[PDB]
Amino acid sequence: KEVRKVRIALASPEKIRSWSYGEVEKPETINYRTLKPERDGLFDERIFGPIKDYECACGKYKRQRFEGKVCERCGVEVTKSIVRRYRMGHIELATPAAHIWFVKDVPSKIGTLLDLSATELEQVLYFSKYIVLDPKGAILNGVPVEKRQLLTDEEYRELRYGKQETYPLPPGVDALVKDGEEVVKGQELAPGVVSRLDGVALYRFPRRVRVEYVKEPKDYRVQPHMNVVVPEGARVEAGDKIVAAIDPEEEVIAEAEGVVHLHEPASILVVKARVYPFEDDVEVSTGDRVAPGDVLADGGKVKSDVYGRVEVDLVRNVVRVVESYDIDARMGAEAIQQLLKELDLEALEKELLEEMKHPSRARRAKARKRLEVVRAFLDSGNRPEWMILEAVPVLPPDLRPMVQVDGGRFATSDLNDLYRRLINRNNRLKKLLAQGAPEIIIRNEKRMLQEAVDALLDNGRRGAPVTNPGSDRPLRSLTDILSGKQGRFRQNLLGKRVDYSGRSVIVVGPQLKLHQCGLPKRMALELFKPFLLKKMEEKGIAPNVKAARRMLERQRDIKDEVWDALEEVIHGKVVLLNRAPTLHRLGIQAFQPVLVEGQSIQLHPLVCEAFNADFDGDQMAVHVPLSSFAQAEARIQMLSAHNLLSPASGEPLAKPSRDIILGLYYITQVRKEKKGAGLEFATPEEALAAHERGEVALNAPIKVAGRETSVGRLKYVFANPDEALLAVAHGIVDLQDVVTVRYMGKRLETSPGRILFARIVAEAVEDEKVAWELIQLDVPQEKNSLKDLVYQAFLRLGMEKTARLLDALKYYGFTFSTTSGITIGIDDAVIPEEKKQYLEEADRKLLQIEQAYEMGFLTDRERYDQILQLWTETTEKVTQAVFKNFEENYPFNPLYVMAQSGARGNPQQIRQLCGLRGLMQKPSGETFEVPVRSSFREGLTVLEYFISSHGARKGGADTALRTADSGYLTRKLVDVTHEIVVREADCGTTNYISVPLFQPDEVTRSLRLRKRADIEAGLYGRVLAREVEVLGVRLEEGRYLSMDDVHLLIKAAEAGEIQEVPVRSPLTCQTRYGVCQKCYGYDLSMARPVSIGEAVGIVAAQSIGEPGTQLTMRTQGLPRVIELFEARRPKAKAVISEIDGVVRIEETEEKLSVFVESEGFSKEYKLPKEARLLVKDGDYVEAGQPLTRGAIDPHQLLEAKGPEAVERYLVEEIQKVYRAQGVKLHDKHIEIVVRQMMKYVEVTDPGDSRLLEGQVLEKWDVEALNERLIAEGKTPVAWKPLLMGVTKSALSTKSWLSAASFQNTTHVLTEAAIAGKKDELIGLKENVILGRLIPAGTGSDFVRFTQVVDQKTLKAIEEARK
DNA sequence: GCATCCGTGAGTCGAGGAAGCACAATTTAACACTTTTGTCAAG
DNA sequence: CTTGACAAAAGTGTTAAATTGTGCTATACTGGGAGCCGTCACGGATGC
Ligand SMILES: [Mg+2]
Ligand SMILES: [Mg+2]
Ligand SMILES: [Zn+2]
Ligand SMILES: [Zn+2]
């Protein structure tokens, strides 16, 4: 079957053991001598499979005949060695270990279910405090001990073993207390030592024993290696032992009868216990635990009266019960797993739901968070105790290989070292437990085992990272393998390295057609090698494919017919050319290769702008689509000649450029003379006669009788363009001379160059009548006029004729720029004579500013501002003087022509070359008082050059630090919008948006018509939601708006006939998981309605992010866009009115306050003194209308005005940044991203549903839920619109595969696993990860099942059946 | 409300690759021999 | 198709090296060692 969904869930110890083919019991990897895997180790063949196909370890089975067999000698299955990549083992832990993901991922899942703080969980898990599981009637400091109570180590010891203390008596002294006498706190035991607790006092080591013989206080000395064998106050018959020793020579016995008295204790032991004397055998033993009433000895004659630990003292023949309780308190994951197994999720949910009615919001907020985790376990079917590991899975050995390098050295992965540590510690703990080691040692081993598991799963998350000894590089754990820019997702699943790919330097191919590229022969030989081998065999070049491959291995073995065969292999095929960074989809284009000699790829000039490529050393990659589908898609969808318009704005993107523009501008610009320039005559005979006398120039404007003409128009009248260009060939007239020509039945007055341009377009499109309508004859052909020509040709003729026109424009532009005579010399940077006059004026005004400043008429700051204004004004005047000189005296100056035509440079750069450099800014942001008064032609001074370097470095640093921000933003946009596709023709919605044609300019306090570019960016290629009647023209509902329609609407607005246009937009589309054809509009790249199955989400992200690097960075620029897409609260946020009413300013010397007064309401706003109010007294302000200047908080705007208002604000404010930079971007692309930001709602009233108040879900889901509920007469859910940024919107998506591959992988995976989330594979990222066909383009269900059949077969099938 | 803390994020290709010994237990190697296998000429 | 010599071609069985695993030292010894350090954003969680 086909995979349709991917589910993630917790694995139980039972399931982990079902995966494993065996337990890894030893940390041995391979044998150091034979290099074979060690038995029971991390590379065992008996577990993970054979190392070579169909061959066991012992070498008894060596063929596939014994397939599925297991050798009895070695136990290795006889099968394929590839199973060694898929077969898992496991490690059986001596004690449970918590999974760090469900502990350290804030908020922890284990803590939330158990109601334990982050610190409390850590203290228990890492053996710092005990947690009570059974108090057993234990009292701690007069208070009963309760379950789930945390005990410190001292508290546990006091409760479990009691209170006791040893006081060392000074040598020689004798204690004031006897052995076995009860003491009270503060009592003095010895002359200088006082006890601190009440209990039985016991002599530890009596140094002197004083017996009393009866006939006599004989004494004996006690040494450390001796022990007394009798209790105090004992009658000893002559002969009985008294003090024992290692050597019987020093052993002490009693000569006669007496009473033994012990004196001089080494120390005093105070123990809180009850002493029970006995005579017969005791029924208990040391270490036993007893309760009140339990029999101790003498058949019930002596019984316990208190809880404690029973210890029998045979020397004193008494039973001591050290008062203590048998409390059950545990540390580590064994205790936590005990609590997690005892949880009743049914009971917990009921209690949480009851607490969901608490008046406090914090209590309900906490209850909702707990119940969301509880609900996840209840719904998914997972068990909370599965978050603690009893068996640890072991990765297949081939994914953590230990390989021998070409030099014989061994390389291994970090996972083997992490596995060995866990196995070594696990084995050691088992040995310690078998030895009955003390609790201190066991606790250290268990704490180390927990840490070893943590390092294996997520190294460095908790504590110091584990490093391999001899280095400080942290070991790479399982979490590091999956997360980050170098993880599995982004490095191996979302992108890959591919076969049939090449690379080389790119050079310009001017002779190529738009759809052609120059592919080196030696690159194409390797790229198409499998195809070439087949063709070589098909011909007689080689006998078979293997012989052909040997021929190609040696360069000197390649014959000349191999190149003929290669030419046949590539016939008709295309290749993909790729340049990094791929900012938009035009960074990959398909071309038909032309095999060329050399080693560099030839690139067509007209596609360089789309690739952002130049020829300073750039490189491109080459890719070969292999199947018929890949070749068809590349030739139809990705061919360069088919993508001529911009998907972002719909304007031409393959169009005339630097040299092409210059050559076409040069011929279409007319000459202007000054010799005559005014003389008036009576007849043309006189006017021409003066021309022969030299009094008037050919192109000097004159007036013959009443009309203004020139000599050329009167002297040279040509019957047709061919005659005019024949005269140009003979040198009679120039291309720039204005003469009279007869063309298309009209007696035009133009230059031969403009008539030549008209013929160029006419022949390219092969239509003289249509060509005449496409061009503007009476202007020089600059970048904008040539861009309009391409767009109009595309509309009227299509891709094929437009690509031909682009090829003809490129050819003639190149040809005419070579012979025109364009060059740059030092004298071409003409210095206006007005610069000297302006600088002298600035010196006088500056000297006058200093004079006033000396007189005190102004301060330092106003002196500083006035200086900057003076030099800012002078720079503008010098710029104007520079360009006024060019257009009057040097209209054909190379710098003027390049800037005027759009080929190169702008007025700012020309001023620095010809005028003055201007003012420079300090590193701190201030501007130097003294400007750079020299241009580049004159040459800066050393100090001026250094001062100018401050800004140059700052610009370079801004550019470097701006690429990372723009690239990061694009990735956020792609991940939030990647699932949006055009999925149907129409969603049936009746909603729409009104695009405003007028903008409320506040300075003039009135409405003013918006700019054409702004209106076009919001109207072009959009479906009219309602019928519109303007200027006698009826634009019916459902009509796509072309540029002509948009211009008609702008003309209607100019006449006061329409203020806004109702259109369909992605904001109001009702399609699920995408938009419909009617809500999107045109495919701006083709100027026609978008086709179903297009990934408009990806296009929108690339359109927005591509010009991201052109946004200034230095609340403005790219930072402004990033904040708007993240829905961040501005620091200097404006103040808006929550309700509508009249403003009443109460400004006072004490404070500033603004009052919005209504019929009954009076809202008060305390604004700061430095507040730039934009509303004065007596103004009727509506809800959400700003009162103070600044950026509006989108979340405050959403609450006050609504979803529509915030959506309009976000689109307009984002477009302002791009417009300020000259970038043209359709509103559709922003509205698609904004539609994703506003995709969620918050539950406020659950109604008759299981939703929790404050729960965040998708708007589509709640709407579907509400309609279902209403269908059955149940109260619907009341929700609240929600706004979130692109980052948060992408992470809260319903597909965990796409969210896990974005960022926050541990958090995404931990929540998905607990909930048992199932991924339906809806968007593009999920299908790319699994290598499936994406549900867009040719992979969309709308077009995927189309069938093609010819007439003959169709008739046979219909005939053969009917 | 609020600071303060921690945790996660920050463009793309390319090119650069320090015991020592004793002894027991286990494994490996080298014989030995018999037992297939592969040829041979026939027949 | 056999039919008997033949000869390596291989395997089975001891034996002895060669390798590997393991236990044991008796003056008295009793709590570690390396960072050190120029960024900025955000949530989100808690200390209350
Ligand atoms: Mg370059
Ligand atoms: Mg004439
Ligand atoms: Zn085997
Ligand atoms: Zn729609």
From Swiss-Prot:
<dbReference type="InterPro" id="IPR000722">
    <property type="entry name" value="RNA_pol_asu"/>
</dbReference>
<dbReference type="InterPro" id="IPR006592">
    <property type="entry name" value="RNA_pol_N"/>
</dbReference>
<dbReference type="InterPro" id="IPR045867">
    <property type="entry name" value="DNA-dir_RpoC_beta_prime"/>
</dbReference>
<feature type="binding site">
    <location>
        <position position="987"/>
    </location>
    <ligand>
        <name>Zn(2+) 2</name>
    </ligand>
</feature>
<protein>
    <recommendedName>
        <fullName>DNA-directed RNA polymerase subunit beta'</fullName>
        <ecNumber>2.7.7.6</ecNumber>
    </recommendedName>
</protein>
<keyword id="KW-0548">Nucleotidyltransferase</keyword>
<dbReference type="InterPro" id="IPR044893">
    <property type="entry name" value="RNA_pol_Rpb1_clamp_domain"/>
</dbReference>
<dbReference type="GO" id="GO:0000287">
    <property type="term" value="F:magnesium ion binding"/>
</dbReference>
<dbReference type="GO" id="GO:0000428">
    <property type="term" value="C:DNA-directed RNA polymerase complex"/>
</dbReference>
<feature type="binding site">
    <location>
        <position position="56"/>
    </location>
    <ligand>
        <name>Zn(2+) 1</name>
    </ligand>
</feature>
<feature type="binding site">
    <location>
        <position position="1079"/>
    </location>
    <ligand>
        <name>Zn(2+) 2</name>
    </ligand>
</feature>
<dbReference type="Pfam" id="PF04983">
    <property type="entry name" value="RNA_pol_Rpb1_3"/>
</dbReference>
<feature type="binding site">
    <location>
        <position position="614"/>
    </location>
    <ligand>
        <name>Mg(2+)</name>
    </ligand>
</feature>
<keyword id="KW-0804">Transcription</keyword>
<dbReference type="Pfam" id="PF04997">
    <property type="entry name" value="RNA_pol_Rpb1_1"/>
</dbReference>
<dbReference type="Pfam" id="PF00623">
    <property type="entry name" value="RNA_pol_Rpb1_2"/>
</dbReference>
<feature type="binding site">
    <location>
        <position position="1069"/>
    </location>
    <ligand>
        <name>Zn(2+) 2</name>
    </ligand>
</feature>
<dbReference type="GO" id="GO:0008270">
    <property type="term" value="F:zinc ion binding"/>
</dbReference>
<dbReference type="Pfam" id="PF21668">
    <property type="entry name" value="RPOC_hybrid"/>
</dbReference>
<feature type="binding site">
    <location>
        <position position="616"/>
    </location>
    <ligand>
        <name>Mg(2+)</name>
    </ligand>
</feature>
<dbReference type="InterPro" id="IPR048566">
    <property type="entry name" value="RpoC_hybrid"/>
</dbReference>
<feature type="binding site">
    <location>
        <position position="1076"/>
    </location>
    <ligand>
        <name>Zn(2+) 2</name>
    </ligand>
</feature>
<feature type="binding site">
    <location>
        <position position="618"/>
    </location>
    <ligand>
        <name>Mg(2+)</name>
    </ligand>
</feature>
<dbReference type="InterPro" id="IPR007081">
    <property type="entry name" value="RNA_pol_Rpb1_5"/>
</dbReference>
<dbReference type="InterPro" id="IPR042102">
    <property type="entry name" value="RNA_pol_Rpb1_3_sf"/>
</dbReference>
<keyword id="KW-0808">Transferase</keyword>
<keyword id="KW-0460">Magnesium</keyword>
<keyword id="KW-0240">DNA-directed RNA polymerase</keyword>
<dbReference type="GO" id="GO:0003899">
    <property type="term" value="F:DNA-directed RNA polymerase activity"/>
</dbReference>
<feature type="binding site">
    <location>
        <position position="71"/>
    </location>
    <ligand>
        <name>Zn(2+) 1</name>
    </ligand>
</feature>
<dbReference type="InterPro" id="IPR012754">
    <property type="entry name" value="DNA-dir_RpoC_beta_prime_bact"/>
</dbReference>
<keyword id="KW-0479">Metal-binding</keyword>
<dbReference type="InterPro" id="IPR038120">
    <property type="entry name" value="Rpb1_funnel_sf"/>
</dbReference>
<comment type="similarity">
    <text>Belongs to the RNA polymerase beta' chain family.</text>
</comment>
<dbReference type="InterPro" id="IPR007066">
    <property type="entry name" value="RNA_pol_Rpb1_3"/>
</dbReference>
<dbReference type="GO" id="GO:0006351">
    <property type="term" value="P:DNA-templated transcription"/>
</dbReference>
<dbReference type="InterPro" id="IPR007080">
    <property type="entry name" value="RNA_pol_Rpb1_1"/>
</dbReference>
<dbReference type="Pfam" id="PF04998">
    <property type="entry name" value="RNA_pol_Rpb1_5"/>
</dbReference>
<dbReference type="GO" id="GO:0003677">
    <property type="term" value="F:DNA binding"/>
</dbReference>
<comment type="subunit">
    <text>The RNAP catalytic core consists of 2 alpha, 1 beta, 1 beta' and 1 omega subunit. When a sigma factor is associated with the core the holoenzyme is formed, which can initiate transcription.</text>
</comment>
<feature type="binding site">
    <location>
        <position position="58"/>
    </location>
    <ligand>
        <name>Zn(2+) 1</name>
    </ligand>
</feature>
<comment type="function">
    <text>DNA-dependent RNA polymerase catalyzes the transcription of DNA into RNA using the four ribonucleoside triphosphates as substrates.</text>
</comment>
